[PDB]
């Protein structure tokens, strides 16, 4: 999932974009992936209960 | 504001070439003459 980023691949984003907007795109991707992992852990805690 | 330290740089370049004076930019000036750090904080000033 792109999470609204121009792509889901980190290397391509670091490749075709300059730091000023590359940092924002990577921040979007990291926020999305951290949210997905947090959802996974929350669901795992519920199933562990 | 109040600043812990201050440094001022100066130079002469073209008009449209001032576009290259920004953090993390790429170009002749940005890469081979004068490069700002990606986390630079301050102001860039130019005039005719």
From Swiss-Prot, chain A:
Outcome recorded upon mutating residue 15 to A: In strain: Alpha/B.1.1.7
Domain of life (superkingdom): Viruses
Annotated function: Subunit of the fusion protein that is processed upon entry into the host cell. Mediates fusion of the virion and cellular membranes by functioning as a class I viral fusion protein. Contains a viral fusion peptide that is unmasked after S2 cleavage. This cleavage can occur at the cell membrane by host TMPRSS2 or during endocytosis by host CSTL. In either case, this triggers an extensive and irreversible conformational change that leads to fusion of the viral envelope with the cellular cytoplasmic membrane, releasing viral genomic RNA into the host cell cytoplasm.
Protein name: Spike protein S2'
Organism expressing this protein natively: Severe acute respiratory syndrome coronavirus 2 (2019-nCoV)
């Amino acid at each position: 999932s792109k999470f609204g980023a121009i792509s889901s691949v980190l290397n391509d984003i670091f490749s075709r974009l300059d730091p000023p907007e590359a940092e924002v795109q990577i921040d979007r991707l990291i926020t999305g992936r951290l949210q997905s992992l947090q959802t996974y852990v929350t669901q795992q805690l519920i199933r562990a209960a | 504001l109040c600043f812990t330290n201050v440094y001022a740089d100066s130079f002469v370049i073209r008009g449209d070439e001032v576009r290259q004076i920004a953090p993390g930019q790429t170009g002749n000036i940005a890469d081979y003459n004068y490069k700002l750090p990606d986390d630079f904080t301050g102001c860039v000033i130019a005039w005719n």
